[PDB]
Tab-separated table of C-alpha atoms and ligand atoms in Angstrom:
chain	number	residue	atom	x	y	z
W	1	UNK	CA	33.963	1.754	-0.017
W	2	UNK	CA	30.654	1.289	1.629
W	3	UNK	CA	29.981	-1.296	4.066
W	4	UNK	CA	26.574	-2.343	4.598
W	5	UNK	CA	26.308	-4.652	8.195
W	6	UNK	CA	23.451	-6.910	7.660
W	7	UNK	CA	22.605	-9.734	9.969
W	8	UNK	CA	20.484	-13.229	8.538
W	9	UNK	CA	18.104	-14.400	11.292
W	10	UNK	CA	15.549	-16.865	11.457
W	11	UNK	CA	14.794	-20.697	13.373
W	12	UNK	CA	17.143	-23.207	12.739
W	13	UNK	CA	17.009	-25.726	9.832
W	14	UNK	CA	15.350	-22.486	7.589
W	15	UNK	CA	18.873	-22.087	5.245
W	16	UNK	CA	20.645	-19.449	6.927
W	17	UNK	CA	23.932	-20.634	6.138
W	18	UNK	CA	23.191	-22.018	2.767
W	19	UNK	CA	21.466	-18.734	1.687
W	20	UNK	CA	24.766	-16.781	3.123
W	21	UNK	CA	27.442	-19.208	1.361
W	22	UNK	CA	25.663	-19.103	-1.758
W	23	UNK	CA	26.048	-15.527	-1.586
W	24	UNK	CA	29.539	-15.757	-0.737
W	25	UNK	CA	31.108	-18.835	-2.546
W	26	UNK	CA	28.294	-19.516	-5.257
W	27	UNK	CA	27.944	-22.876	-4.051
W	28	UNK	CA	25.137	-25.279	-2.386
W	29	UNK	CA	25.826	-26.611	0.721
W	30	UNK	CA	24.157	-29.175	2.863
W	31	UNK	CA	24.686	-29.747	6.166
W	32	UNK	CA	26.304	-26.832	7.701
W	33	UNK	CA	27.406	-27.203	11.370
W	34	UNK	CA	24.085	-26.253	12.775
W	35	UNK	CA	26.219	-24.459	15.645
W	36	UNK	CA	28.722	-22.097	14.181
W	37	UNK	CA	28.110	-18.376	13.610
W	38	UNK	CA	30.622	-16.292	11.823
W	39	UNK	CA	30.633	-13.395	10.033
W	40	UNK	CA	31.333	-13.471	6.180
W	41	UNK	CA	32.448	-10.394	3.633
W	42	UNK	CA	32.254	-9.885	-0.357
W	43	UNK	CA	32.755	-7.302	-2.592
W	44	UNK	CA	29.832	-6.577	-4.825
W	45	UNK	CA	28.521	-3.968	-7.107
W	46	UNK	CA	25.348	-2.939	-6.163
W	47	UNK	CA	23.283	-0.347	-8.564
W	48	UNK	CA	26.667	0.889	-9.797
W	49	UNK	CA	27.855	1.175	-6.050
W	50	UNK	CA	30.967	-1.110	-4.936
W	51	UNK	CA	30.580	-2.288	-1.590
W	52	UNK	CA	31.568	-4.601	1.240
W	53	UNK	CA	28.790	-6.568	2.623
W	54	UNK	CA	29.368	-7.820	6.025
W	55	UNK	CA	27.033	-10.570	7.036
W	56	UNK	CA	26.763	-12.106	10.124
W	57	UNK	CA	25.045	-16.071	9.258
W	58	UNK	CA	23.301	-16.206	13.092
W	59	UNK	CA	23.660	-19.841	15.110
W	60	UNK	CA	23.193	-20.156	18.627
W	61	UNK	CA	20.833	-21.109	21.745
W	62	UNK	CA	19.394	-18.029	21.970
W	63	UNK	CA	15.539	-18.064	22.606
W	64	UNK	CA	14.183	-16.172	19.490
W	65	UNK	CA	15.964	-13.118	19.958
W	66	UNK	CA	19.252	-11.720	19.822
W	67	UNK	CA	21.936	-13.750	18.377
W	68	UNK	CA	25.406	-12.053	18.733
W	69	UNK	CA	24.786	-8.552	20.309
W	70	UNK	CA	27.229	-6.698	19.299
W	71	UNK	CA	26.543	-7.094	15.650
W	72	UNK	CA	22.508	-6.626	16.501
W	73	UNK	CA	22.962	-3.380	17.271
W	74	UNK	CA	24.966	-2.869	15.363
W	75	UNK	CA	23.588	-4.745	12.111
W	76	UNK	CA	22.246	-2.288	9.796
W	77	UNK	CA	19.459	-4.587	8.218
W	78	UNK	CA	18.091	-7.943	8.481
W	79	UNK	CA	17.630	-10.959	6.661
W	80	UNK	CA	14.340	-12.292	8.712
W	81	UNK	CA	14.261	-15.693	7.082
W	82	UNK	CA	11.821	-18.887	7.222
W	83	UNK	CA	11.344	-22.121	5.096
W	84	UNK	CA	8.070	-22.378	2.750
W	85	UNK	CA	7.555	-25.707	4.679
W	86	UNK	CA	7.981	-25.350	8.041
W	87	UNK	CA	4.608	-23.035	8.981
W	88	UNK	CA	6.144	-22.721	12.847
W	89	UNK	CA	9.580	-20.969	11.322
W	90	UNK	CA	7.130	-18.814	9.924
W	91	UNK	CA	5.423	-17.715	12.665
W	92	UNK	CA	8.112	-17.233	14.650
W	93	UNK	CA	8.879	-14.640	12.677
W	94	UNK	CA	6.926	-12.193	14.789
W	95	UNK	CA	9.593	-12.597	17.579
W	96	UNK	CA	12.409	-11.812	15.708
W	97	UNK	CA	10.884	-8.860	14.149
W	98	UNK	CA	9.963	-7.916	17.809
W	99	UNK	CA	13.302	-8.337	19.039
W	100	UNK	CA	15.251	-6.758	16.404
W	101	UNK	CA	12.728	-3.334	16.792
W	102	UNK	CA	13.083	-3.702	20.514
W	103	UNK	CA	17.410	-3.718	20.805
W	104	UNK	CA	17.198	-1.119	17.883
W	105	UNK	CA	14.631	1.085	18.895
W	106	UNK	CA	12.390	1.593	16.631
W	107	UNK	CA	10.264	0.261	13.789
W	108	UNK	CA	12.107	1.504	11.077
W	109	UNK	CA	14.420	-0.359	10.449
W	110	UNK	CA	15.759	-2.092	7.828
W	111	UNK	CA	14.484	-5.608	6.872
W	112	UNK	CA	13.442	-8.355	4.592
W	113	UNK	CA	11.346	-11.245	4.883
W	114	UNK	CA	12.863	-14.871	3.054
W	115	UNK	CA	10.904	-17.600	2.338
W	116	UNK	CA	13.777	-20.192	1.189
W	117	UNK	CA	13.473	-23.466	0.034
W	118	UNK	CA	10.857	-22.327	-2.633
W	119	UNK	CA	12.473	-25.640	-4.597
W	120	UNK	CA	10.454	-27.775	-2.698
W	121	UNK	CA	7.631	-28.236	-4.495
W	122	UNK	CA	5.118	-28.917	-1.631
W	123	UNK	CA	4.496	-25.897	0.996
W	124	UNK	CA	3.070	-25.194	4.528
W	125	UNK	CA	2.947	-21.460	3.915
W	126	UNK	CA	1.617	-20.205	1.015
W	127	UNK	CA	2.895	-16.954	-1.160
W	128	UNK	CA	0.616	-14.966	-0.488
W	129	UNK	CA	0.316	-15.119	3.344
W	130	UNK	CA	3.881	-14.454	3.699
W	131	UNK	CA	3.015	-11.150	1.084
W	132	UNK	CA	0.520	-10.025	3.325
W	133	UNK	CA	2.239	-10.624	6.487
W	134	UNK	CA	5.500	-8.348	4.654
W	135	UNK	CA	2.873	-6.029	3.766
W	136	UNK	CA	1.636	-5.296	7.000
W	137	UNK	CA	5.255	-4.880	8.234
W	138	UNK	CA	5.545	-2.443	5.401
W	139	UNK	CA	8.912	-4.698	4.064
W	140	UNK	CA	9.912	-7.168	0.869
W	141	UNK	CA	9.131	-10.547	0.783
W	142	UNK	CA	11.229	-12.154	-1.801
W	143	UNK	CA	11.305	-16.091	-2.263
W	144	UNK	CA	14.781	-18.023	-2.522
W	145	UNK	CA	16.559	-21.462	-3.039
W	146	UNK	CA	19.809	-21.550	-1.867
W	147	UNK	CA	19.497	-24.903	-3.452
W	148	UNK	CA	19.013	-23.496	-6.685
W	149	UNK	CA	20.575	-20.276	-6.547
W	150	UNK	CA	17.037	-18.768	-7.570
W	151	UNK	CA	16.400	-15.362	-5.701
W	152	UNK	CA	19.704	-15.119	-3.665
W	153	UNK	CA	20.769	-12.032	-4.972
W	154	UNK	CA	17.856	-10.364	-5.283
W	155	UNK	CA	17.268	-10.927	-1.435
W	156	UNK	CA	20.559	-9.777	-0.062
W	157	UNK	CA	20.121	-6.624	-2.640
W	158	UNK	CA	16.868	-5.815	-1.785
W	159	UNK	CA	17.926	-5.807	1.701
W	160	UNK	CA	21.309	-3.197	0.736
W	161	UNK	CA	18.625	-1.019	-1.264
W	162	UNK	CA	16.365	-0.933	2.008
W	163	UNK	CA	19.589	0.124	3.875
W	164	UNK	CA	20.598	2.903	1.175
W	165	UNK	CA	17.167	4.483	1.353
W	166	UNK	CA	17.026	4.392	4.821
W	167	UNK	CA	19.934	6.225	5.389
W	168	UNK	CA	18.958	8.994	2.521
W	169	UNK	CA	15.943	9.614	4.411
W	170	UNK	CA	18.126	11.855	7.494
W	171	UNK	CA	19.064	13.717	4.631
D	1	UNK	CA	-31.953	-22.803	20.728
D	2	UNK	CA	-28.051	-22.722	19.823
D	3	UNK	CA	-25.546	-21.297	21.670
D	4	UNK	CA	-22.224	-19.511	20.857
D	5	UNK	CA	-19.336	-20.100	23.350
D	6	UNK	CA	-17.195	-16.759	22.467
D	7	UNK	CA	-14.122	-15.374	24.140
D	8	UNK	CA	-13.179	-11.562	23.992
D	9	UNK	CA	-9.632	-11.458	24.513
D	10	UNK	CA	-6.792	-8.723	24.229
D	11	UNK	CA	-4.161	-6.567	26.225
D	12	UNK	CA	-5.973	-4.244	28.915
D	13	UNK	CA	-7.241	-1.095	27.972
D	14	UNK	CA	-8.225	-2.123	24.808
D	15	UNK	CA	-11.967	-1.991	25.316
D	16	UNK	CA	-13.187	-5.765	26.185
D	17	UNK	CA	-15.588	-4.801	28.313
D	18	UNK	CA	-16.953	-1.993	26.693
D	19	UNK	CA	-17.504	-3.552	23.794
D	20	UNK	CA	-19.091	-6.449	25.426
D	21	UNK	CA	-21.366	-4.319	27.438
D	22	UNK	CA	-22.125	-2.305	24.589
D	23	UNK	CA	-23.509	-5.077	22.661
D	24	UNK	CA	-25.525	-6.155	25.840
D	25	UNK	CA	-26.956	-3.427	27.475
D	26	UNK	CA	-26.713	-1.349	24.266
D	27	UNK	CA	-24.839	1.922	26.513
D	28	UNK	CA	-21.145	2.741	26.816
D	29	UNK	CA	-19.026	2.487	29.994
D	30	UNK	CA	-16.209	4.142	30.736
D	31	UNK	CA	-14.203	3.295	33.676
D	32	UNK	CA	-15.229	-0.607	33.998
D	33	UNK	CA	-13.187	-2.719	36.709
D	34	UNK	CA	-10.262	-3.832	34.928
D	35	UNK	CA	-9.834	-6.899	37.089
D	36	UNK	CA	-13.453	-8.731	36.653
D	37	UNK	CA	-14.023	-11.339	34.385
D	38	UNK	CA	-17.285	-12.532	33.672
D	39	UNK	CA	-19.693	-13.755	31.601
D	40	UNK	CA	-22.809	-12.116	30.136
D	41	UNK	CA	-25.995	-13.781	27.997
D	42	UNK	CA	-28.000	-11.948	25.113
D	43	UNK	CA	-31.101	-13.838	23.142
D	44	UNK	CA	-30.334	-12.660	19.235
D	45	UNK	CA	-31.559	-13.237	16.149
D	46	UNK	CA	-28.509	-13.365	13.625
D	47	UNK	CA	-29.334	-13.996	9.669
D	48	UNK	CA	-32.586	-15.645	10.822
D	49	UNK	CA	-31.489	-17.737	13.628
D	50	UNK	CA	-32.175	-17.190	17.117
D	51	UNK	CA	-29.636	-17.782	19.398
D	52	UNK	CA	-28.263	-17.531	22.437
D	53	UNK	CA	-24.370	-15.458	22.671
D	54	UNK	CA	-22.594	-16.798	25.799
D	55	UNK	CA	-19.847	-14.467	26.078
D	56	UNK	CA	-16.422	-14.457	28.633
D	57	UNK	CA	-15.011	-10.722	28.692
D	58	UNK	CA	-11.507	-11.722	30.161
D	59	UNK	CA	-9.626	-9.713	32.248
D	60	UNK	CA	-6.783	-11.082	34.453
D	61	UNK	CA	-3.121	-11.486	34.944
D	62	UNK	CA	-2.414	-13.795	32.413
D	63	UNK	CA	0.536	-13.479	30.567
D	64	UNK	CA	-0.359	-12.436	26.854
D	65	UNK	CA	-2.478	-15.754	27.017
D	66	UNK	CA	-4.955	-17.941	27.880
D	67	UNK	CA	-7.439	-16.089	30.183
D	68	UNK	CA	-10.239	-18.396	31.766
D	69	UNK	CA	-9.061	-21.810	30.920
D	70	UNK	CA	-12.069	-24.152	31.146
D	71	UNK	CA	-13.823	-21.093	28.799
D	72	UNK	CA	-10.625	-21.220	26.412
D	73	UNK	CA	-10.303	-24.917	25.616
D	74	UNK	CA	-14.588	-24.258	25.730
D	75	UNK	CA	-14.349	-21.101	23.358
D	76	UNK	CA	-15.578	-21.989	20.258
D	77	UNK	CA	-14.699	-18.741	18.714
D	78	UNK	CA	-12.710	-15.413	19.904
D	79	UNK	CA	-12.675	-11.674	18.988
D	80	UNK	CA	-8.839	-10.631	19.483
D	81	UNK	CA	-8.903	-6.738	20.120
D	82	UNK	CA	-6.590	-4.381	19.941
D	83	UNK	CA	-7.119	-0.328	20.000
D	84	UNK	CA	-6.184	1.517	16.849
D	85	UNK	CA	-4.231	4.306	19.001
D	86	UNK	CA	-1.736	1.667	20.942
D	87	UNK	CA	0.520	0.474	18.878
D	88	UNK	CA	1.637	-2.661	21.350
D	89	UNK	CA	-1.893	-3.843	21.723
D	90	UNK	CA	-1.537	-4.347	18.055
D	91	UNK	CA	1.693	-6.165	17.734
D	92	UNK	CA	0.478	-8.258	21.088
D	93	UNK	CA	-2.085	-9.896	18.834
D	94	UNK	CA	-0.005	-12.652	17.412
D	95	UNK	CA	0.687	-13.849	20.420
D	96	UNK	CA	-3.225	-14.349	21.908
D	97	UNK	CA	-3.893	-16.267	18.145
D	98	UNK	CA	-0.893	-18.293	19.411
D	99	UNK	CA	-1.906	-19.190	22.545
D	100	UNK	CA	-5.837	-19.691	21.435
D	101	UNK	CA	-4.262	-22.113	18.544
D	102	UNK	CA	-2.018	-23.702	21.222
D	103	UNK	CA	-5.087	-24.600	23.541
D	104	UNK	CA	-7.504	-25.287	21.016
D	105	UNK	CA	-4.632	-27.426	18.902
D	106	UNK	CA	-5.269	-25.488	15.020
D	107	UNK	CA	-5.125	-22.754	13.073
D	108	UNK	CA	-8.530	-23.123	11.882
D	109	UNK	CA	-10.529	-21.920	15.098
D	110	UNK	CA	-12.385	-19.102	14.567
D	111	UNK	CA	-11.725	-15.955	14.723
D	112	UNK	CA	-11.978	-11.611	13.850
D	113	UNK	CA	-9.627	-9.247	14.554
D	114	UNK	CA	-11.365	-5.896	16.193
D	115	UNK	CA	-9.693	-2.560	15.569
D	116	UNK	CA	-11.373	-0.522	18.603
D	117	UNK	CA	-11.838	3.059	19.722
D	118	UNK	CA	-12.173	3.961	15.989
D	119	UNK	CA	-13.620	7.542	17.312
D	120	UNK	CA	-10.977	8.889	17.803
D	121	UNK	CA	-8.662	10.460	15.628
D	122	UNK	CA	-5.698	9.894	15.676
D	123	UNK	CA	-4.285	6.518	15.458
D	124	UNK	CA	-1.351	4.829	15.635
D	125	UNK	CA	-2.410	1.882	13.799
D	126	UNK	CA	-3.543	2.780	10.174
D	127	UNK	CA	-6.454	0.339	9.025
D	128	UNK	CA	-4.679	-1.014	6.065
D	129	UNK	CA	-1.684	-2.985	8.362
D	130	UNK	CA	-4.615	-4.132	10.156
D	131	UNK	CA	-6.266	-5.593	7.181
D	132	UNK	CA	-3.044	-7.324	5.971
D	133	UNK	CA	-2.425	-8.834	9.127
D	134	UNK	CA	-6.021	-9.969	8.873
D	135	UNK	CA	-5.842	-11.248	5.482
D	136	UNK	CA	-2.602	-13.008	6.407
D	137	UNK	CA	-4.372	-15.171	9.280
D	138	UNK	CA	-7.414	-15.636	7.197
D	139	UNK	CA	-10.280	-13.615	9.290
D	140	UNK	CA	-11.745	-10.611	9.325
D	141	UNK	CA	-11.346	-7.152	10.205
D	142	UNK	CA	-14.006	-4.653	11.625
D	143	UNK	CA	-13.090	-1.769	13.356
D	144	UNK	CA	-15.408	-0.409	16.165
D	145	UNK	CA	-16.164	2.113	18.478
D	146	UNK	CA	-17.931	1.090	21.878
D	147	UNK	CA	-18.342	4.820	22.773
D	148	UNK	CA	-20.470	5.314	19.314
D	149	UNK	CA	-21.321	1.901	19.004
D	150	UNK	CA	-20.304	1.781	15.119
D	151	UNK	CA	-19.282	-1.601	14.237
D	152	UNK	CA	-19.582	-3.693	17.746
D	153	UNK	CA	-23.081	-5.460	16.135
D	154	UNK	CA	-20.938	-6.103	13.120
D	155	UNK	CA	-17.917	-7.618	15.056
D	156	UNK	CA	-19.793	-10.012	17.622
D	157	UNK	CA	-22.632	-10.977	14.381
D	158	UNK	CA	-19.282	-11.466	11.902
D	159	UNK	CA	-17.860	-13.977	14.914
D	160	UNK	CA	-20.932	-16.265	15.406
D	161	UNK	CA	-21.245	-16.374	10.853
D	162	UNK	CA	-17.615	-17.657	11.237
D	163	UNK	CA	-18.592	-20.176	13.939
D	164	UNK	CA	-21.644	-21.237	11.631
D	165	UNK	CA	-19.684	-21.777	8.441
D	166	UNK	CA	-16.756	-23.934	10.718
D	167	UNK	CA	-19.385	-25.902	12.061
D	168	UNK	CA	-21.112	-26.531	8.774
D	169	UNK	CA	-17.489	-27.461	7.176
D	170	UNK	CA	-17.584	-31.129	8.827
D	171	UNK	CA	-20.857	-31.142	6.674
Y	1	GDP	N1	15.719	-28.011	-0.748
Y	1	GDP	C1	16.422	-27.055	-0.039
Y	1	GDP	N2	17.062	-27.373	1.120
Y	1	GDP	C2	17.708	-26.287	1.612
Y	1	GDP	C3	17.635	-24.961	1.148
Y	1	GDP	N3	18.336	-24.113	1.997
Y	1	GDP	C4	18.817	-24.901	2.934
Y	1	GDP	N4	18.479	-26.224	2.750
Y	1	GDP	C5	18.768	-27.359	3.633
Y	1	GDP	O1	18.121	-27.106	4.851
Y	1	GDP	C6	18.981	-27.567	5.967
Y	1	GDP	C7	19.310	-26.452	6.841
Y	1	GDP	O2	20.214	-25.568	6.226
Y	1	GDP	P1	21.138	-24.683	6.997
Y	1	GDP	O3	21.655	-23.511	6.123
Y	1	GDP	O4	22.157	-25.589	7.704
Y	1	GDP	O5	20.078	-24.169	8.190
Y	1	GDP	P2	20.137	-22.953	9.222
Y	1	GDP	O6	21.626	-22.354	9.025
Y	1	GDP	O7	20.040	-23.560	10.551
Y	1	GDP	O8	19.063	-21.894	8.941
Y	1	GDP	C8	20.145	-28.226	5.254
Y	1	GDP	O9	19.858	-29.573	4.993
Y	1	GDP	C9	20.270	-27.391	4.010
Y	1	GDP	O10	20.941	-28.155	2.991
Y	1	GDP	C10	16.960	-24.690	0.050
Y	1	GDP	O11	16.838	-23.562	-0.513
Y	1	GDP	N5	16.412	-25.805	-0.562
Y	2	GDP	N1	-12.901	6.688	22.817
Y	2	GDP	C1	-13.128	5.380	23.204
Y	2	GDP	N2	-12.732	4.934	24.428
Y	2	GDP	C2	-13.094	3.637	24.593
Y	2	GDP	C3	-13.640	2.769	23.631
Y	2	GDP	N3	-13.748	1.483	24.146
Y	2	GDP	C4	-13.288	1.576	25.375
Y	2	GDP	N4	-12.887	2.852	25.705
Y	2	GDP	C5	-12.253	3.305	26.946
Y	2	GDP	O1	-11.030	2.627	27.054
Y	2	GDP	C6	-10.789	2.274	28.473
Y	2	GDP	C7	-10.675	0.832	28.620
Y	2	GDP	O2	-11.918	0.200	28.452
Y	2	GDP	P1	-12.245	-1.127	29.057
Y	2	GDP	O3	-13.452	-1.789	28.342
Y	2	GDP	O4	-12.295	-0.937	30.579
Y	2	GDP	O5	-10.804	-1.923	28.742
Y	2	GDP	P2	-10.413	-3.470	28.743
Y	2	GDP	O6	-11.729	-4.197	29.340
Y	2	GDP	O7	-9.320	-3.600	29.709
Y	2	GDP	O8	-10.071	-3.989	27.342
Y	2	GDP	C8	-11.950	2.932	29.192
Y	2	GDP	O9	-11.632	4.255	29.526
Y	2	GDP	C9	-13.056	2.821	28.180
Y	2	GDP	O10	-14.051	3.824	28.452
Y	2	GDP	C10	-13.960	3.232	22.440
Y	2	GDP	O11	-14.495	2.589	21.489
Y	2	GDP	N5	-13.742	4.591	22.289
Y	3	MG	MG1	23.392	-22.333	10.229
Y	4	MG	MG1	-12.174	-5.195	31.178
């Protein structure tokens, strides 16, 4: 079947591994060893397409880059993800963006921007400057809970979708 | 009379000094001394109010910074430029608002964003990115041209009205 290679990134403490698990097992989970960085696979149906989605949930001491090398080169989209209350997560998103166009090579390609935690009724960062920010990068924004479930899907598929059309585009 | 501390600040090339001589001496330079820094004075009557612009056209190696410290902790407001036909001076932008929050400790200094070299066509950096980036951080946009002059009145007068409503804001 297909496999789409897509890689979650973002500071620490954002939800990288709950937003990944939740895909994965359809369960919440708290405290997930901040450390650990593994890949993780499902079988999903996509717009009528079956495919393997290979995600790679990002840990590690590794100055707002790169995280696991060869799988960034190699990733075929991101998951650029930050917590509605933590405004620095958020702007660190810049780097990652940065980073991810600069081992790829170009600014094309494929990403989405996460705001998680949208359960938390509070905020530092505020809908609509995330939407602009997206906008300017020309990518989704799409607002989850991987405490709730709520959006989940719809960012991991929007991210496959971004993949698919990218790769109709050589032809 | 009052007087404006303001900071022009941006990757090299861009067109600091031009525009900054432009609004001075009202004539364009090409070829300015990328390495000086200085300051330059103009008397100017802005929505009624006469005042006096004080500002620090920075040039110097400074890592993607803080350019004339005991200016930039002084600054009370800074025009970030970029040129709409290089692409890096664009993205290098977050960084300088970084650095000018980091300094000035918030994210409520003020500030415009200045698309310059408008005249020419071409571009690598369409307007409406620009404008969501702006819209994102909360400031405005102009775009200018310090070889025609369009817009540089606009960009320095749009600074100081920001500057005015901040300071009236602590009532
Ligand atoms: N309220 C809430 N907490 C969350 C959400 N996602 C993650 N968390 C919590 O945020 C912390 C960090 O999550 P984790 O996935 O370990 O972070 P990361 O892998 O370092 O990005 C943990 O306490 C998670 O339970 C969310 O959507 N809602
Ligand atoms: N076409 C055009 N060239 C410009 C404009 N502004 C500056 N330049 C040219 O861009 C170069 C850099 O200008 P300068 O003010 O020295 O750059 P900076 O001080 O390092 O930001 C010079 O060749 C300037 O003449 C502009 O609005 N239009
Ligand atoms: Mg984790
Ligand atoms: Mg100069």
């Amino acid at each position: 079947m297909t496999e789409y290679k897509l890689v979650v990134v973002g500071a620490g403490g954002v939800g990288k591994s709950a937003l990944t698990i939740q895909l994965i097992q359809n369960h919440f989970v708290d405290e997930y060893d901040p450390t650990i960085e593994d890949s993780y696979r499902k079988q999903v149906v996509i717009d009528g397409e079956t495919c393997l989605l290979d995600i790679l949930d990002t840990a590690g001491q590794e100055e707002y880059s790169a995280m696991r090398d060869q799988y960034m080169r190699t990733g075929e989209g991101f998951l650029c993800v930050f917590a509605i209350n933590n405004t620095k997560s958020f702007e660190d998103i810049h780097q990652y963006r940065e980073q991810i166009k600069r081992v790829k090579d170009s600014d094309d390609v494929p990403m989405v921007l996460v705001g998680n935690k949208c359960d938390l009724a509070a905020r530092t960062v505020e809908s609509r400057q995330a939407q602009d920010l997206a906008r300017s990068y020309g990518i989704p924004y799409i607002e989850t809970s991987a405490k709730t479930r709520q959006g989940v899907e719809d960012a991991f598929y929007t991210l496959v979708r971004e993949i698919r059309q990218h790769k109709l585009r050589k032809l």
